[PDB]
Design a protein around this motif. Structure first.
Motif, PDB file in Angstrom:
ATOM      1  N   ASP A 102      28.481  64.342  34.734  1.00 44.46           N
ATOM      2  CA  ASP A 102      27.604  63.902  33.642  1.00 44.46           C
ATOM      3  C   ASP A 102      26.356  63.182  34.210  1.00 44.46           C
ATOM      4  O   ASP A 102      25.232  63.457  33.773  1.00 44.46           O
ATOM      5  N   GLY A 103      26.585  62.260  35.154  1.00 46.74           N
ATOM      6  CA  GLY A 103      25.563  61.490  35.850  1.00 46.74           C
ATOM      7  C   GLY A 103      24.836  60.403  35.078  1.00 46.74           C
ATOM      8  O   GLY A 103      24.011  59.709  35.682  1.00 46.74           O
ATOM      9  N   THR A 104      25.125  60.209  33.763  1.00 55.28           N
ATOM     10  CA  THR A 104      24.448  59.183  32.940  1.00 55.28           C
ATOM     11  C   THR A 104      25.287  57.892  32.757  1.00 55.28           C
ATOM     12  O   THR A 104      24.818  56.951  32.102  1.00 55.28           O
ATOM     13  N   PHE A 105      26.513  57.821  33.354  1.00 59.42           N
ATOM     14  CA  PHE A 105      27.320  56.595  33.267  1.00 59.42           C
ATOM     15  C   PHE A 105      26.896  55.568  34.331  1.00 59.42           C
ATOM     16  O   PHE A 105      26.739  55.914  35.502  1.00 59.42           O
ATOM     17  N   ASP A 106      26.697  54.312  33.919  1.00 63.33           N
ATOM     18  CA  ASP A 106      26.370  53.196  34.822  1.00 63.33           C
ATOM     19  C   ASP A 106      27.633  52.743  35.593  1.00 63.33           C
ATOM     20  O   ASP A 106      27.590  52.508  36.808  1.00 63.33           O
ATOM     21  N   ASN A 107      28.755  52.644  34.876  1.00 64.52           N
ATOM     22  CA  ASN A 107      30.035  52.226  35.433  1.00 64.52           C
ATOM     23  C   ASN A 107      31.235  52.764  34.639  1.00 64.52           C
ATOM     24  O   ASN A 107      31.085  53.370  33.572  1.00 64.52           O
ATOM     25  N   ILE A 108      32.427  52.509  35.179  1.00 65.84           N
ATOM     26  CA  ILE A 108      33.716  52.831  34.589  1.00 65.84           C
ATOM     27  C   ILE A 108      34.530  51.536  34.620  1.00 65.84           C
ATOM     28  O   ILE A 108      34.451  50.790  35.599  1.00 65.84           O
ATOM     29  N   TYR A 109      35.224  51.224  33.517  1.00 61.96           N
ATOM     30  CA  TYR A 109      35.966  49.976  33.434  1.00 61.96           C
ATOM     31  C   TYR A 109      37.202  50.070  32.566  1.00 61.96           C
ATOM     32  O   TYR A 109      37.382  51.039  31.854  1.00 61.96           O
ATOM     33  N   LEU A 110      38.071  49.067  32.676  1.00 58.51           N
ATOM     34  CA  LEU A 110      39.333  48.959  31.943  1.00 58.51           C
ATOM     35  C   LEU A 110      39.875  47.530  32.013  1.00 58.51           C
ATOM     36  O   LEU A 110      39.413  46.722  32.829  1.00 58.51           O
ATOM     37  N   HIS A 111      40.880  47.241  31.176  1.00 57.22           N
ATOM     38  CA  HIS A 111      41.589  45.973  31.185  1.00 57.22           C
ATOM     39  C   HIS A 111      42.953  46.185  31.806  1.00 57.22           C
ATOM     40  O   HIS A 111      43.591  47.204  31.553  1.00 57.22           O
ATOM     41  N   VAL A 112      43.380  45.252  32.671  1.00 55.66           N
ATOM     42  CA  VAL A 112      44.691  45.333  33.311  1.00 55.66           C
ATOM     43  C   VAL A 112      45.331  43.960  33.147  1.00 55.66           C
ATOM     44  O   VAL A 112      44.792  42.973  33.662  1.00 55.66           O
ATOM     45  N   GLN A 113      46.472  43.900  32.436  1.00 54.45           N
ATOM     46  CA  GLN A 113      47.257  42.677  32.255  1.00 54.45           C
ATOM     47  C   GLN A 113      47.482  42.067  33.657  1.00 54.45           C
ATOM     48  O   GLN A 113      47.854  42.788  34.569  1.00 54.45           O
ATOM     49  N   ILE A 114      47.191  40.774  33.837  1.00 49.95           N
ATOM     50  CA  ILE A 114      47.246  40.108  35.160  1.00 49.95           C
ATOM     51  C   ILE A 114      48.590  40.276  35.894  1.00 49.95           C
ATOM     52  O   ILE A 114      48.579  40.322  37.121  1.00 49.95           O
ATOM     53  N   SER A 115      49.714  40.469  35.176  1.00 49.79           N
ATOM     54  CA  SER A 115      51.039  40.643  35.821  1.00 49.79           C
ATOM     55  C   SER A 115      51.265  42.053  36.425  1.00 49.79           C
ATOM     56  O   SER A 115      52.262  42.287  37.119  1.00 49.79           O
ATOM     57  N   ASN A 116      50.332  42.987  36.146  1.00 51.87           N
ATOM     58  CA  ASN A 116      50.427  44.360  36.609  1.00 51.87           C
ATOM     59  C   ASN A 116      49.821  44.545  37.992  1.00 51.87           C
ATOM     60  O   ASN A 116      48.791  45.197  38.168  1.00 51.87           O
ATOM     61  N   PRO A 143      52.036  37.857  30.242  1.00 53.01           N
ATOM     62  CA  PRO A 143      50.827  37.019  30.113  1.00 53.01           C
ATOM     63  C   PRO A 143      49.777  37.665  29.213  1.00 53.01           C
ATOM     64  O   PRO A 143      49.667  38.897  29.140  1.00 53.01           O
ATOM     65  N   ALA A 144      49.055  36.819  28.473  1.00 52.92           N
ATOM     66  CA  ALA A 144      48.042  37.206  27.503  1.00 52.92           C
ATOM     67  C   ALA A 144      46.718  37.565  28.192  1.00 52.92           C
ATOM     68  O   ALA A 144      45.811  38.122  27.563  1.00 52.92           O
ATOM     69  N   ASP A 145      46.615  37.233  29.482  1.00 54.67           N
ATOM     70  CA  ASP A 145      45.418  37.457  30.273  1.00 54.67           C
ATOM     71  C   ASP A 145      45.282  38.859  30.855  1.00 54.67           C
ATOM     72  O   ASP A 145      46.256  39.454  31.331  1.00 54.67           O
ATOM     73  N   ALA A 146      44.044  39.341  30.900  1.00 49.82           N
ATOM     74  CA  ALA A 146      43.752  40.644  31.495  1.00 49.82           C
ATOM     75  C   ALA A 146      42.543  40.592  32.424  1.00 49.82           C
ATOM     76  O   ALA A 146      41.489  40.080  32.047  1.00 49.82           O
ATOM     77  N   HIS A 147      42.677  41.177  33.606  1.00 47.79           N
ATOM     78  CA  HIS A 147      41.540  41.352  34.503  1.00 47.79           C
ATOM     79  C   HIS A 147      40.705  42.501  33.938  1.00 47.79           C
ATOM     80  O   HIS A 147      41.258  43.417  33.321  1.00 47.79           O
ATOM     81  N   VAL A 148      39.390  42.470  34.182  1.00 47.96           N
ATOM     82  CA  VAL A 148      38.496  43.551  33.827  1.00 47.96           C
ATOM     83  C   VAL A 148      38.232  44.161  35.200  1.00 47.96           C
ATOM     84  O   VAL A 148      37.813  43.444  36.118  1.00 47.96           O
ATOM     85  N   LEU A 149      38.566  45.448  35.358  1.00 50.64           N
ATOM     86  CA  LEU A 149      38.338  46.200  36.588  1.00 50.64           C
ATOM     87  C   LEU A 149      37.196  47.154  36.348  1.00 50.64           C
ATOM     88  O   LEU A 149      37.170  47.823  35.316  1.00 50.64           O
ATOM     89  N   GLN A 150      36.228  47.161  37.267  1.00 50.81           N
ATOM     90  CA  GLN A 150      35.043  47.998  37.157  1.00 50.81           C
ATOM     91  C   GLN A 150      34.672  48.658  38.448  1.00 50.81           C
ATOM     92  O   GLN A 150      34.677  48.024  39.515  1.00 50.81           O
ATOM     93  N   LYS A 151      34.306  49.937  38.337  1.00 51.74           N
ATOM     94  CA  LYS A 151      33.760  50.725  39.426  1.00 51.74           C
ATOM     95  C   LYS A 151      32.324  51.113  39.001  1.00 51.74           C
ATOM     96  O   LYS A 151      32.123  51.697  37.929  1.00 51.74           O
ATOM     97  N   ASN A 152      31.345  50.773  39.839  1.00 50.69           N
ATOM     98  CA  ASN A 152      29.953  51.120  39.591  1.00 50.69           C
ATOM     99  C   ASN A 152      29.678  52.544  40.015  1.00 50.69           C
ATOM    100  O   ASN A 152      30.260  53.019  40.994  1.00 50.69           O
ATOM    101  N   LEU A 153      28.807  53.243  39.261  1.00 47.34           N
ATOM    102  CA  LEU A 153      28.471  54.652  39.524  1.00 47.34           C
ATOM    103  C   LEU A 153      26.985  54.916  39.806  1.00 47.34           C
ATOM    104  O   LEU A 153      26.142  54.030  39.661  1.00 47.34           O
TER     105      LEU A 153
END
Ligand SMILES: CC(C)(COP(=O)(O)OP(=O)(O)OC[C@H]1O[C@@H](n2cnc3c(N)ncnc32)[C@H](O)[C@@H]1OP(=O)(O)O)[C@@H](O)C(=O)NCCC(=O)NCCS
Ligand SMILES: CNC(=O)c1csc([C@@H]2C[C@H](NC(=O)[C@@H]3CC(=O)N(C)C(=O)N3)CN2C(=O)c2ccc(-c3nnn[nH]3)cc2)n1
Length: 153
Positions: A102-116, A143-153
């Motif tokens: 596609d080539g128009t995405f700035d990044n890719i991201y998701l939420h991951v529960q901190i215990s994972n 846990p109620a907390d989640a890391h935000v994981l991101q890969k830049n493109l």
């Protein structure tokens, strides 16, 4: 070549199988709207098959936030007895391939529960970074907390 893993399209005929897979794999429930949206995202949602047995799935959406075009991975998972066979990699590579073509995405991201810990390891291997830790992202699970994981493109 000779791979036992194949990704297939999600359709009204197999959406019940996707819903079932998510129910068993994930600690949170996804509403009827999530599954309706999944039927409309095309290649951003797939079922993963191991020897023609549906064992995992990936559901993504296009996100327009932070003045960016971002790919948001909502769910990516594999049934516990089929883990560490490259099923997750096949699903993540599929979405990284779409983004590259596609080539128009700035990044890719998701939420991951901190215990994972295993999911954090998995994504970090693909060049995703922990960019933030969201306190109380989840409401009914611990846990109620989640890391935000991101890969830049
Ligand atoms: C995270 C998950 C999707 C990984 O899928 P998988 O099919 O086991 O992944 P793969 O077999 O492709 O693993 C790829 C690599 O990630 C790393 N990794 C994966 N699981 C790991 C673990 N338990 N411990 C350490 N490293 C791990 C490894 O380097 C692995 O390569 P290797 O197996 O050659 O060593 C899977 O564990 C899962 O279904 N968990 C529940 C879903 C989830 O929690 N995702 C939340 C974000 S949406
Ligand atoms: C525009 N957005 C959408 O259309 C859209 C649809 S779902 C979504 C996102 C995707 C996100 N995915 C993850 O968190 C993944 C998978 C997983 O299950 N886990 C644990 C993990 O580690 N990572 C969850 N989600 C929530 O908003 C969400 C869902 C449930 C709860 C909750 N809290 N208490 N009970 N239910 C809190 C937040 N967004």
């Amino acid at each position: 070549k000779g791979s036992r893993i194949e990704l297939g399209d999600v359709t009204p005929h197999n959406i019940k199988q996707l819903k079932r897979l998510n129910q068993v794999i994930f600690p949170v429930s996804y509403n009827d709207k999530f599954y309706k949206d999944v039927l409309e995202v095309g290649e951003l949602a797939k079922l993963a098959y191991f020897n023609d047995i549906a064992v995992g799935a990936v559901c993504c959406r296009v996100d327009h936030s932070q003045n960016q075009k971002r790919l948001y991975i909502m769910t990516l998972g594999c049934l516990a007895p089929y883990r560490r066979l490259g099923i997750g990699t096949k699903m993540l590579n599929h979405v990284l391939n779409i983004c590259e073509k596609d080539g128009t995405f700035d990044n890719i991201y998701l939420h991951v529960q901190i215990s994972n810990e295993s999911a954090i390891d998995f994504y970090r291997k693909f060049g995703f970074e922990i960019i933030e830790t969201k306190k109380n992202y989840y409401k009914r699970i611990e846990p109620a907390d989640a890391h935000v994981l991101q890969k830049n493109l």
